[PDB]
Design a protein around this ligand. Sequence first.
Ligand SMILES: Nc1ncnc2c1ncn2[C@@H]1O[C@H](COP(=O)(O)OP(=O)(O)OP(=O)(O)O)[C@@H](O)[C@H]1O
Ligand SMILES: [Mg+2]
Lengths: 52, 172, 29, 210, 70, 193, 122, 52
Amino acid sequence: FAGVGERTREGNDLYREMIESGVIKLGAERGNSKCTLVYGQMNEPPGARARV
Amino acid sequence: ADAKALDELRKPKFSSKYLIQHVSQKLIPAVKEWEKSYQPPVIHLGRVLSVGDGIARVYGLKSVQAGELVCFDSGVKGMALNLQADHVGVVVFGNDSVIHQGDLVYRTGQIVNVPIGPGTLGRVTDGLGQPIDGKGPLTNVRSSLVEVKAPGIIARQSVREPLFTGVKAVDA
Amino acid sequence: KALDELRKPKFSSKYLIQHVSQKLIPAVK
Amino acid sequence: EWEKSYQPPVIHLGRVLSVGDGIARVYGLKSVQAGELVCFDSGVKGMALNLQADHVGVVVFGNDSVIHQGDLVYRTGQIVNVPIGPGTLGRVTDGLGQPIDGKGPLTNVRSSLVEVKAPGIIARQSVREPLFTGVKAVDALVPIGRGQRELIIGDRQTGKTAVAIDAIIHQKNCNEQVPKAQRVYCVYVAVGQKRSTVAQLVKLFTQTGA
Amino acid sequence: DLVYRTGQIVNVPIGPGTLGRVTDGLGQPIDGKGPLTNVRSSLVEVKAPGIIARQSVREPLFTGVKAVDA
Amino acid sequence: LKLPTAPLQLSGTSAQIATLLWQVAAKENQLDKVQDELYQFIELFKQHSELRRLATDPFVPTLVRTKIISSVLKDSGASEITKKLFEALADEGALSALLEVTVNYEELMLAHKKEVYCTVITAEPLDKLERVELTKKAEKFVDAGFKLVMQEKIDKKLLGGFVIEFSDRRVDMSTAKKVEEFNNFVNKLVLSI
Amino acid sequence: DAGYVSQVIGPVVDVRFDGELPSILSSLEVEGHSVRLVLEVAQHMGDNTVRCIAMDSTDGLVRGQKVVDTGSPIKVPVGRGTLGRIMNVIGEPVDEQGPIDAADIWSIHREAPEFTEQSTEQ
Amino acid sequence: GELPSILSSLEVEGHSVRLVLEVAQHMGDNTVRCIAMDSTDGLVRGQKVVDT
Ligand SMILES: Nc1ncnc2c1ncn2[C@@H]1O[C@H](COP(=O)(O)OP(=O)(O)OP(=O)(O)O)[C@@H](O)[C@H]1O
Ligand SMILES: [Mg+2]
């Protein structure tokens, strides 16, 4: 998932909803995750949103 | 016109000295004839090149940060916005009629900040932090930057609590 | 390092060559 | 015959003043032509597009991240040309004539300039013989002659490419039942398209025979 | 080219010699009837008369058009 | 009003000033008399921080700057062209243009001796008959009677020969490029033949 | 070795180097800054100056601040170590769970896949 | 000698009317930039201007 210049609230919503649904796992079972998040949201300067 | 012979000129190649020993003992008695027209040079302070419409172009101010509060010698504050190579573009927090060419500009050391805390609860304030309600200065308050980065993903949580507005079209 | 301040000139008066030529041709005797 | 008449040519240099956004401002290149191919130190080509009194504005044929300030720019002495000829048939070339289909170098071709002057009044002739597109709306109502410029205009995803590819496929179908003289040889130029779109088109053209 | 100043703000000939004459936008005649004779030069950029210098419009200027003058 | 032609055309607003300076110095036979004055004033800007203050500080008035420059050069043993040039550059605060007027004046002056600076890359250290024959072929890449200021350099990745780098054009008469243009010539005939 | 900040206008920083300019799209680190400020070289200005875009805020930059060249574009961790992690534009973990243990950090800048390696199945 | 303040009024000597200038900007190089209260037709670039 590449969050390019969006709301940080819905990025947190996606992160939480993939913590519960098991797409992202934490701790020792981190390697059984299937999603990499890269986030460049709206509070970032325009250089960080152009390259995320 | 390129920089290589332009750097070769840093090496001396004069081959004669019939002006150098003449004017070097003639320069300092000439400069001292005009020392009341000279303004003192400026490095870490600032000096106004041009002022107009709320913008001061400030010569000097070597160690200012971008977005930093500056203070002119007439008391009115400023904000160093675009730091160009030969001058600093300073926006004026007030009326720029008290700023002249050659006025000293002082760097304050702080990025722009306002008083935050429970002491602001009840006051009528200007856009910079000073109270305008005529009830004295701000007490029980502390200074905080106006350019705080927003809290990220791990700092937030989901919005659950209502905060009703009392307008039933909105709240319905 | 003392001549790094003069490695590129910046001035007003786009017609600078006119004001130099109104001083240099009377330097010819 | 080559060694007995061989002088190595004097190649005029140029120093990159500034580079950015695929534009290289180049000092020097004192005798360069407008629209002439230049060559950089990084092997990337260029074109002297606007010649100014102090520098040359060079458009960069590729990614300008390999060009630095002070890089040497050599002029090639020639206006931009492409290989033309019958060896270009069946070949997927890029915008400069270089092949991108992976089928080796272009055999049986010759170089010719990309910007030739258009033929004048006495060079023309009245457009009388038809060009069949195979689309019966076009062939019936909006007919085409050989030598015509017909704009396929419309919004996105309405079938402009479909009309063009049907014209090319119908020229392949008509090319089997006519003699050598009245055969139509098609060229499809894909300007700014997606690179996976133009692999579907070479798949469809190698599947149909076009 | 040499540019000479005339010593005067931009002026046109005004007076009774202008009546009957076709003129360009600068004051010199184009009808081919020679120069303007009984005339004198005044500025083209005059400040309008003020508030005391005016009075209310009383007299009628008849256009001769029926729809206008009615 | 008749001025002698400069040896080469140049850029704007700091090269045409040097072109005009050369044009009025060649009328008074005074080229090498003002070239060392340009270098001397460069050394003067190197020496004093109060004389390069007139070139960089924008708070000194143009009256004060012109009165320092005029009352410092009270004929100074110097040329009148130099004195009428520097009070002209002091009237605009264009004293920082001196360090490029000197570059373009050096270019005009070494073009005045038809001299040509270049560097030569060879594979081997040269013999003094190999050197004087190299100048017999290098002179035909100059379209005048310019006797060059050729230097030498060695890099044996060349397979013999010479590469003349004239600082604006390169002439690669090396054998290592000849054997590459030989290979590129015979690789294209066998694809057609 | 390093360059210095010449001009800050908004999110665009002009960095001046004395010899050996960085390439376009190269990454530059600013030290002396509070947070890690990464500038990516957008273009060469021409008199030994590069013009950059910043990956964080330019509030705090001083004209003359030391800017060091990385010699490479923005490199980020890639691989199995990034699965289940939140990254920045410059590859930092912002999920507050340790570092990102991924091998073979890659540049974010490469050219497109060329024409022959294009799939046609649907 | 010394520059007027911004909004300070100036008066031009020797004009056909009373030409009052009002200083709007300091442009640097000891130069102010003014806004004339009457017409400027007839102004020469050497005219004495008195700071009020
Ligand atoms: N005659 C037709 N019959 C059925 N389908 C068609 C016809 N012409 C076009 N289409 C369909 O319409 C779609 C768009 O066609 P086409 O790509 O030719 O239009 P376009 O204007 O070139 O689109 P774009 O602007 O996106 O390139 C295609 O997916 C194609 O399958
Ligand atoms: Mg299409």
